[PDB]
Design a protein around this ligand. Structure first.
Ligand SMILES: OC[C@H]1O[C@H](O)[C@H](O)[C@@H]1O
Ligand SMILES: OC[C@H]1O[C@H](O)[C@H](O)[C@@H]1O
Ligand SMILES: [Cl-]
Ligand SMILES: [Cl-]
Ligand SMILES: [Cl-]
Ligand SMILES: [Cl-]
Ligand SMILES: [Cl-]
Ligand SMILES: [Cl-]
Ligand SMILES: [Cl-]
Ligand SMILES: [Cl-]
Lengths: 268, 267
């Protein structure tokens, strides 16, 4: 009666809210939900030995080999999502990353920003990469040369956003796409400390719509993933797989949406 | 080789940072750390799964469940935070009474005499100790226990947000929020009501989670040594596993005042 959830980063509200959505569904079927913070030790092997019944895997740190050796051999069904690539004989839930990046780009470009900084994790996971590709598709619509993107790779965290502020200030960028909300919060701090204002000096759009977006000032404009629902959907898929081992293999895709708040403005 | 960490609220950065401190130590001894959000039979199920030891930060795990599952099956455990002490366990605590006292003394030194307490309804004992410490400070300044504006709410950003209207028509000029998440709720509520911090309200929070340094003004707060708390809890458990008959310990770690920019002298 135990389901294991493997995430890249439990300190990110995205993954704790994901967990809450999972728990919301599993609790009703008397499953215990446990969470592992697995980034880049044999998590799967140990948890499989402990008799964990099924897994929900959101991290790329869990390899195909580890899944084959432990989950498949021992008949433990699993769901993949988020940073984890698809696997044979698993169900998946994904959100529309390409679309979300496209929406972010189109918003900044509609406001007249033409020199734009991209704040993103060095060596991004594939879902994050797809956001960047969608953003570049928006640049193509506006015929912005891809080398007018100011690339600001950093650590995927508030601290990482904070640390690239000096580079942002030394660039000609007027708008910023932060590849998650945590990165954006880092930028807020850096810009505040440098005596700058949002949106007067910089338009910023983030990604996820974690709750904190509504508690900072100005409130952060962002691409909303349906985070809680993503967790619920992953849990429902797993319960259905446990109840119906031979049901159709599914790769569900949930939409994102633009959440317009007060961290962007037309370029003057 | 698996250790179970039971927390009351994984969405609170306090508990995810706690977890990171625990992992930091356990990882080095090749232990797998798993986390449960517990506020059904967690212990019974995880004990059956062969979880080797537990770190229990939630009061939602009962003495009976511990006896029936952990003690019977020889699984050592550590208690902390919201969880009360248990026989034949080690504990690590932070100085809650002191922290509340520091918060009260700070607001009172600034001239605030009508103060609001924003706290969780049905507070756990550690949070109650903070409130008692705060009241001790009010005693030093001979503030009746009356003026104190009592604003119980849900233990969350949303809870802090939702008691803002109650705060606004009180005579309070200073606020002690019983954690940083509650304080963030107040920021949002006060901003939307067109108020300023600290010009209209002095606010002091509790925990010193990372976000305190990313909001504006930066939040004045009582720091718990969160990461170190997790590390200490993990070290105690490993020592108990290596030395089952070592001294039973109740470690207590200090708190400290983090003065930032969300308070100011009353004008
Ligand atoms: O915010 C954390 C990011 O990493 C994950 O991949 C999530 O999709 C989220 O956007
Ligand atoms: O911030 C969460 C609070 O609940 C817990 O009891 C912690 O000590 C912390 O202050
Ligand atoms: Cl969230
Ligand atoms: Cl949040
Ligand atoms: Cl803010
Ligand atoms: Cl949702
Ligand atoms: Cl959500
Ligand atoms: Cl079937
Ligand atoms: Cl400040
Ligand atoms: Cl011993």
């Amino acid at each position: 009666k135990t389901i294991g959830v493997l995430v890249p980063d439990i300190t990110n509200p995205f993954f704790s809210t994901l967990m809450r959505g999972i728990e919301d569904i599993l609790y009703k079927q008397n499953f215990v939900t446990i969470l592992c913070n697995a980034d880049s030790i044999e998590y799967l092997a140990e948890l499989t030995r402990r008799g964990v019944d099924g897994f929900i895997i959101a991290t790329s740190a869990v390899s195909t080999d580890a899944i084959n050796e432990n989950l498949k051999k021992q008949g433990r069904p699993f769901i993949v999502l988020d940073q984890k690539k698809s696997e044979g004989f698993s169900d998946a839930v994904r959100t529309d990353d390409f679309r979300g990046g496209y929406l972010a780009g189109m918003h900044l470009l509609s406001l007249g920003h033409q020199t734009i900084a991209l704040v993103y994790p060095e060596n991004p996971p594939e879902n994050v990469h797809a956001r960047i590709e969608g953003f570049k598709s928006a640049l193509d619509v506006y015929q912005i040369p891809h080398d007018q993107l100011i690339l600001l790779p950093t650590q995927f965290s508030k601290q990482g956003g904070y640390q690239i502020t000096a580079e942002l200030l030394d660039s000609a960028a007027t708008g910023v796409f932060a590849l998650n909300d945590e990165l954006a919060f880092g930028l807020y701090r850096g810009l505040e400390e440098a005596g700058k204002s949002i949106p007067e000096d910089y338009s910023i759009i983030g990604y996820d719509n974690i709750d904190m977006c509504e508690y900072i000032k100005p409130k952060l404009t962002t691409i909303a993933q349906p985070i809680f629902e993503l967790g619920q959907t992953s849990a429902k898929l797993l319960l259905d797989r446990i109840q119906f081992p031979e049901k159709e293999w599914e790769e569900k895709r949930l939409p994102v949406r633009f959440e317009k708040r007060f961290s962007t403005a037309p370029l003057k």
